[PDB]
Design a protein around this ligand. Structure first.
Ligand code: OGA
Ligand code: MN
Length: 316
């Protein structure tokens, strides 16, 4: 029974003039992690710690808004199925804050104009921004961070492509077409503290991510995140590690690679005595891209259709 998920330092791919043996070591480590656990800590990404802390501060700033203002940009009011804006708690009573055992989020993605023909299609459309927050304090750093997340997942994808079975003869750029005009939702999540009830409580229940790559920024604090490892049937805890992101593969990556890279069930247990924040970035990818199974098996899957199928099947 493994006690931890692996750590991968990708400095060799971020820094200049790294040896080919160092790069190959990165490739092998990431490939093994993603084909065994579907999860790993990533360090060496080069994103300044001040930028990461600024993102968590944006999460806290948004949550501090009163409920009526947040509800003003509720995801109910977004365009079509773009799913942008404020995702409210399941229960609420007051303008300020959250009831225990609840959560809220701000969700934003790639900015697509309202008059664009694709606007309102799945995960595609204009963002909703809270008008009371100054741009220098919210929208601007979030969009700059989104730029950095896009660069990071492109590097991750190149490492993943170099880690596929050699008999498949996959180029290092096999995944790159998913990163053009992609669905890239990011959430600023606020979890309330646990309640006093004497039953297990979760910030997120048992699930898989549906997309390609997920990039999670955690806040210093209690362990929430756990990863289901089937062979030993055990939940691996994923504590916060300074400087790292938690990376995991989603269902679309698992489909694309014919099961070689695993999309693992995970959950967040609520052991927080105070509000906790997190910021996951999700590469779903170009919703219209037709992905052929990389083992040459001739199977074809459209990213948007796959994710909508997963949403329709993930009901109860
Ligand atoms: O906040 C966390 O620890 C993990 N987040 C998720 O699984 C999610 O937002 O889908
Ligand atoms: Mn998840």
């Amino acid at each position: 029974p493994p006690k931890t998920i692996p750590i991968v330092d990708i400095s060799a791919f971020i820094d200049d003039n790294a040896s080919a043996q160092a790069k190959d070591d990165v490739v092998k480590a990431m490939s093994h992690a993603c084909s065994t656990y579907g999860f790993f800590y990533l360090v060496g990404h080069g994103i300044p710690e001040v930028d990461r802390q600024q993102v968590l501060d944006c999460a806290r700033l948004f949550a501090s808004l009163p409920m009526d203002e947040k509800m003003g940009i509720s995801v109910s009011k977004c365009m079509g199925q773009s799913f942008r804006g404020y995702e409210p708690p399941a229960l609420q009573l007051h303008q300020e804050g959250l009831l225990p055992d609840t959560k809220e989020a701000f969700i934003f993605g790639r900015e697509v104009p309202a008059d664009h023909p694709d606007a309102g299609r799945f995960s595609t459309g204009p963002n909703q921004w809270p008008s009371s927050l100054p741009d220098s304090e919210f929208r601007i750093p979030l969009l700059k961070y989104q730029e950095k997340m896009v660069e990071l997942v492109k590097v991750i994808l190149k490492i993943l492509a170099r880690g596929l079975p050699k008999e498949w003869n996959c180029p290092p750029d096999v995944f790159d077409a998913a990163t053009v005009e992609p669905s890239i939702p990011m959430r600023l999540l606020h979890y309330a503290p646990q309640s006093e009830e004497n039953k297990k409580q979760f910030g997120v229940g048992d699930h898989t991510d549906f997309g390609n790559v997920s990039v999670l920024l955690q806040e210093e604090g209690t362990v929430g995140l756990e990863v289901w490892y089937p062979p030993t049937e055990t939940w691996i805890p994923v504590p916060v590690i300074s400087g790292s992101y938690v990376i995991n593969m989603g269902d679309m990556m698992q489909k694309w690679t014919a099961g070689f890279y695993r999309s693992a069930r995970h959950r967040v247990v609520n052991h927080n005595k105070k509000s906790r924040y997190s910021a996951p970035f999700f590469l779903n990818g170009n919703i219209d891209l037709k992905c052929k199974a990389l083992d040459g098996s001739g199977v074809e899957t459209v990213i948007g259709e796959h994710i909508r199928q997963r949403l329709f099947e993930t009901i109860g």
